[model samples]
Target: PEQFRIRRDKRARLLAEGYDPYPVAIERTHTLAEIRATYADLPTDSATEDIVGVAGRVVFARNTGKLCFATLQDGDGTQLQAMISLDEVGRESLDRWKADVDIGDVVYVHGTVISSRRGELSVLADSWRMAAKALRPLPVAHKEMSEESRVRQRYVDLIVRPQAREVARQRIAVIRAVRNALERRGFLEVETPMLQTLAGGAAARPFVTHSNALDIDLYLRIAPELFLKRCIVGGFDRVFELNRVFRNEGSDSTHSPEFSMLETYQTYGTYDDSALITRELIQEVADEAIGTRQLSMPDGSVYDIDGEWATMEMYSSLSEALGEQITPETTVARLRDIASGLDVEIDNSVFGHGKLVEELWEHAVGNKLTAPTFVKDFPVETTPLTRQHRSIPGVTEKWDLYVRGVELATGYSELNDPVVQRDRFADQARAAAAGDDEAMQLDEDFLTALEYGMPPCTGTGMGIDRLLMCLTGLSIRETVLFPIVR
Candidate 1:
């Protein structure tokens, strides 16, 4: 409160003195980054007459003898020093700068470039004015703030934390890289409905809303899968949607209620094609966003995106993890016993054999996975929307990619057979009616689209937020710009 009062009083004084504390416009000749790069060769204790106008927020300010020194940080995370000497602007201006200026004020400075005796590049200011006065003080740049403060006040975090800026910029770059990568591959980007009558794409609970005009219930789309495939049926050969999805789900260190997904579908493609695209897309994003094919995971292990990723069949891996034979015909009661032996918790009545098998792998194997891996050939009972494996008898053509013990992506050869799809949807409906809240609700409209004949198509949906975590070793909370905090 005292700081706010002081800042308000300073603004009042500026207005009284016929000076604008918040000017409409200020001319800036060069960014601080340009000066840093252009004048690195200037000798120590040298001054250049190359007059330039620069503007940024003051991160640090202090008075030494008759000189008022301040560090200004630009939006691009570049810092420049401003040196106001009494000889340049007379004693009155120097003292005024010391008295009026504070950290966090946006100011315009005009000065000649000079290399300090300590070999630091600085602007020796002859003239400066307040561009915008900050009513609130900035947090200490060197000190770490609480996580709550960092997220709730991301604007302040950006001002104080370089890592925050780095992560945010990297996220932007990654999103752009994804778009470019898809466009280069001739994939047409399209938007799908965010509000729908029934959320049918994936097996996830949807956030429901009421429409006053229609007097009906609408659900926020949990996934854009069904609509994207409808695009494929409508003859958009290669289509993708990179947008937000809302799931009525719990949040954790790696998951948020709202997140971004990149879903792409290509006609006459198989699960193998999706696998290739996934690898290349991640590689390109890594090269563009971070400039490396290698990623350092949070678990202190390096995962290289350049190499051949290891693939394991889900049932095979589960069998190996349990040291017992797990097959397509594994009985539900038997798998429940196996889960008990592994000390994994499960409600026998609520879980099917497929879910039991999957949970066993998660408890016994998935969390221990260190490198980038594609676990394929999911159980038929679990993957309702995926196609049956062409060659494999009892598994579906689905794959989920894991990196650093987290599932980053899931993809499959989409099942296009209308009759089979109806059966799958029916099964899901039965599951839902049997108290499975996360089961997919059958959408009659999507089934009708399927009846119109979709080509042999493959699709993939990957969480951009989770993938960012695998690439940058940041948690999902940090990867999302404004994560929901509850």
Candidate 2:
């Protein structure tokens, strides 16, 4: 505390002397990345007098009375060595810098590019100024910090951890590539309301809030499925939204209270079309950011994202896993007994036979599917918004993409018939009344929109965080910039 107070007083003293400790503007010749590229071909064991300006956070510093050296890191995680000598910049300026500058402080230097005698690239400093002052000292060993502290103080984490910065950069690159691929395929990017009267898009609990002016309770959107479909009804042939959706759900390695999703709807398309698009989009983004179509998981399993992906019927997959012929006609009592035998808990009051089948599959088969696959034809009772399967009885044309045991994307041939949709919503309401907290609510307005007639379309929601997690081998907490912390 005393040392921090001294640093704060030093900054105050600089202000009192009409010298801004934190300046408003800076002039730089190039970014640290550019400097590295420009000098890539420069010979080792040499120095140059080419004047340049650079600014970055000081990460490492050492003083030898007459000379000093510091390592500066920029936003791109590029580092540059800066050498300051009293003979070049004079005693007065060098002494002032030595007094004010600390590790983690931002500083600007005007110098010439050079190579040290030890074959290290560096900047020979003629003069320097403080860009920003730091009151609290940085952690001596950032890697040694606790997980709670690392997540709570992400700003410092990013400063000290190169891997953290790289993950963030890759995240941005992935999103940009997603937009590019979608735009090239004629998908118009769009936005939908984050707040709504009824969260009717998915079967998940919503976070509720109240509008002061309207005096009506509003729920944070659990999904933009309703609005995106509304656009299809309004005549947009192809549309997508890359936005955040909120859900009051349990947190885990793969789930967050608030997360980003890439939702897209294509007019006159089916669930098969959605699957093809997903494969191509994944290939494009992987090629862009990771430079490959194959991703290896942390457990040594490999997923080849390119080429033809295999498709499996959900019920058959589960049946194979359970060593029995499970079908739609399978009784809820039998499924519940099987689940109990496996020690997979199921609430008989809230879940029907179809939902129970899903639970069985998740426990018995989901994690076993480590390769890229599309589990297709889900039970109609489990999917309220999906179109009925044309050939499969009691099934909906829905598929979930799985890679390395994690469900990456979900899509369906959308249900366009207003009458059938009304029945589905009614069933959902009944489930809600019967103590299913995760049941979907009836959206009267959405039903009305369906009454206006929607085109035959396909839509999918891809979890951006999950995709990044698979690509980077990071957990949900590490991928999210600021996860909810205590």
Candidate 3:
């Protein structure tokens, strides 16, 4: 508050003195990045007459006798130092900079390129002007803030934390790289409606909303799946939608109520075929964005994400963790016993055999998966929309990918037979009545699209925020630009 009052007083004084705290336009010759590139080889203690204009937020400032130095951070997180001397800017302007320039303020500088005796590239400023005056002071450069503060005040976090800047950049890079990879595979990128009458895709609780004009209740999309498949039924061979989806669910280290999902569908592709596609995309995107398949985990270990990732049947992994055989006929009662013994604590009446199996596996094996893994063949009751495994009897051909003990993506050999889907829908409806609120609802419209006959295809929906977490070693909340405060 004192800094705000001080800044406001200075702004008033500057305004009275005919200075503009907020200017309409700024002229710049080069960015901080460009300046670094151009003068990268300049001799130490040398000056060049190539004057350039640059503007950025002042991050570091120091005033010594006859000369002042400040580091300006550009939009792309690049920083360049500005050297202001009495001889260059004259006594009046130098004094003005000393008195008026604050670390959080954005300023434009016009200067000659120079190299300090210490070989640090800098600009020798002849003049400077305030572009925008920040009323609040920034945090100390190296001062650590709590996770709550960092996410809640993301704007301030981006300003003060280099690691926060890196995370933001990584998100952009990951999206760009993913898009590039998709386009290369001939996938038609498309946008689907966020507001839908039926949330028939994945079995997540849809966020309900009301449209005043239509006077109908709609659901914010839990996934873009049902519509993306309509693209297939309508005759797109390869299609993808990378966008935001909402879930009326709890948020945690791995879950966000609203997050980005990259869902792609390919015709004539089986659940097994998607394994190569996913692996390639992860490896390619890793190389393109971060320049390495080797990831530095939060736990002081290097994970080489290149080459083959491990795969296991979901039931087998759960069985390994539970020290017992898990199979198609594993009864709900047996699962109940397993849950109780493992301290999983479940309402056995609410979950049938398949949901029970999923719960047990998630509690037992999901987090312990440190390396990249593909857990295959989920129970049929859990994935009603997935095609039954060709040979696995009762399980569905679905696989979820995990890395660093969190789910990163899921793939399915999409169920296309209308009759089978309707039967599965009926099964889900029964589950819903039995109190599984996340059960799939029957959507005649989507079933009609299925009746139009979607070809044999496989699809994958990967969480973009989750991938960013794996790539950047950030939590789900930190990967998002503006995470929900709650």
Global lDDT of each candidate = 0.87, 0.88, 0.88
TM-score: model 2 vs. ground truth = 0.94
Clashes of each: 0, 0, 0
Which pairs clash inside model 1? Answer: none
User: What are the TM-scores, per candidate, against the unseen true structure?
Assistant: 0.95, 0.94, 0.93
User: What residue pairs are clashing in model 3?
Assistant: none
lDDT of 3 at 465: 83
lDDT of 1 at 479: 73
Give the per-residue lDDT of model 2 (tens digit) for 308-399. 78899999989888899998999988988898899987755537878888888888888777678899999888899999999879899999
Model 1, residue 79: what's the lDDT? 94
Per-residue lDDT of model 3, residues 73-97, tens digit only: 9987889999999999999999999
Q: What is the lDDT of candidate 2?
A: 0.88
Least accurate 10 contiguous residues by lDDT in model 3: 248-257
For model 1, residues 1-486, the per-residue Cα lDDT tens digits are 987999999999998998889988688999999999999788988888899999999988888888888899999889999989889878888877887888899999998999878888999999988999999988765266888877787888888888888899989999999999999999999999999988878877789899998899999999999999899899999999999999887543456778899999999988888988998888898998889987876678777778778998888988888888899898988988877776877864458767877887788878889878899998888898899999888789998998778898888999999999889878887877778888877778998999999999999989999889878988777877777765
